[PDB]
């Protein structure tokens, strides 16, 4: 084994007070914000056009992520145990990776429409629900659930003793069996940061870069800021969490006796990430209230009474 540590790893009870409250707010503020966006779409027939089906995909994939992030990560922040059984250790971590897949794919599928709309104006105003979108979505959800397949297989619970305290941890076992998955364990922390963060910011920033160029009558300028912020508040809400895992892979060294302090720091940064990251999925419905008058007029009829 590597050398021992100079001190223990613990999370201040003061922080527990701060974070658990923020998790409670974002949990409620997201369920209402994203369920009231579904209620709006599902009630008005005229709102069901090509792009608005995707918003239902982005919103639908944002309730799953909220629900499968807060209760199981808040519970860890308090209980510090895994009594959920062996099966769910492969289920809960699988779902959240799928849900994050829809959110970033939908933000990419939605991104192309905001370009199609401005550049290809003549043809876009065609069928209400074009068959292309009906088949664009099916791939997006099916691809996402496919890409999260590895997590279910890899994850497994173990048995261990620590400081005289017996413990069980759901995790990705470092002794992965097959070569494909063995590469997975040493690449997951780079896969997630690549496919799910760098790629959508590459795509959504791309089409939105061509939309504003095509669009550019001072109103249309504020339309850009609706996008200049949406992409911006995607990186400010997701950079921490990936940053938390990247630092672990890089700045960690089991051979350094002064390491256990770094592990404590990541727990605070890791737990904040589950809130900031969950805020993004919780923030798109808000962005529709400040710009979309048709949605806002629907929000007023849905939240003010």
């Amino acid at each position: 084994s590597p050398p021992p540590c100079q001190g223990p790893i613990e999370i201040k009870e003061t922080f527990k007070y701060i974070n658990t409250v923020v998790s409670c707010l974002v949990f409620v503020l997201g369920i209402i914000g994203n369920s009231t966006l579904l209620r709006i779409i599902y009630k008005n027939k005229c709102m069901r056009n090509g792009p608005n089906i995707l918003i239902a995909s982005l919103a639908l994939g944002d309730l799953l992520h909220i629900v499968i992030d807060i209760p199981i990560n808040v519970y860890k922040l308090l209980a510090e145990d895994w009594p959920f059984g062996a099966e769910m250790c492969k289920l809960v971590p699988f779902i959240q990776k799928a849900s994050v897949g829809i959110t970033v794919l939908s933000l990419c599928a939605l991104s192309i429409d905001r370009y199609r709309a401005v550049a290809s104006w003549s043809r876009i105003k065609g069928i209400g629900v074009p068959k292309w979108t009906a088949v664009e979505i099916v791939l997006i959800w099916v691809v996402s659930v496919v890409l999260a397949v590895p997590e279910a297989i890899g994850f497994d619970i173990i048995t261990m003793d620590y400081k005289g305290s017996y413990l069980r941890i759901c995790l990705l076992h470092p002794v992965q069996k097959t070569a494909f998955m063995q590469f997975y364990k040493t690449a997951k922390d780079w896969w997630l940061f690549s496919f799910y963060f760098c790629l959508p910011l590459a795509i959504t920033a791309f089409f939105y870069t061509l939309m504003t160029c095509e669009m550019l009558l001072k109103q249309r300028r504020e339309v850009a800021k609706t996008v200049f912020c949406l992409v911006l508040v995607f990186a400010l809400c997701w950079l921490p969490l990936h940053l938390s895992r990247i630092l672990k892979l890089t700045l960690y060294n089991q051979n350094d006796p002064n390491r256990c302090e770094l592990l404590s720091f990541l727990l605070v940064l890791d737990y904040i990430g589950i809130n900031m990251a969950s805020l993004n999925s919780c923030i798109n419905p808000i962005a529709l209230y400040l710009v979309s008058k048709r949605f806002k007029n629907c929000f007023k009829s849905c939240l003010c009474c």
Partner: peptide, 21 residues
Amino acid sequence: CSCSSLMDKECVYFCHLDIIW
């Protein structure tokens, strides 16, 4: 959450206190 191997007691305990991701 994972690292070199379970030979290192401390690192595994970190996964105990870390978000499920």
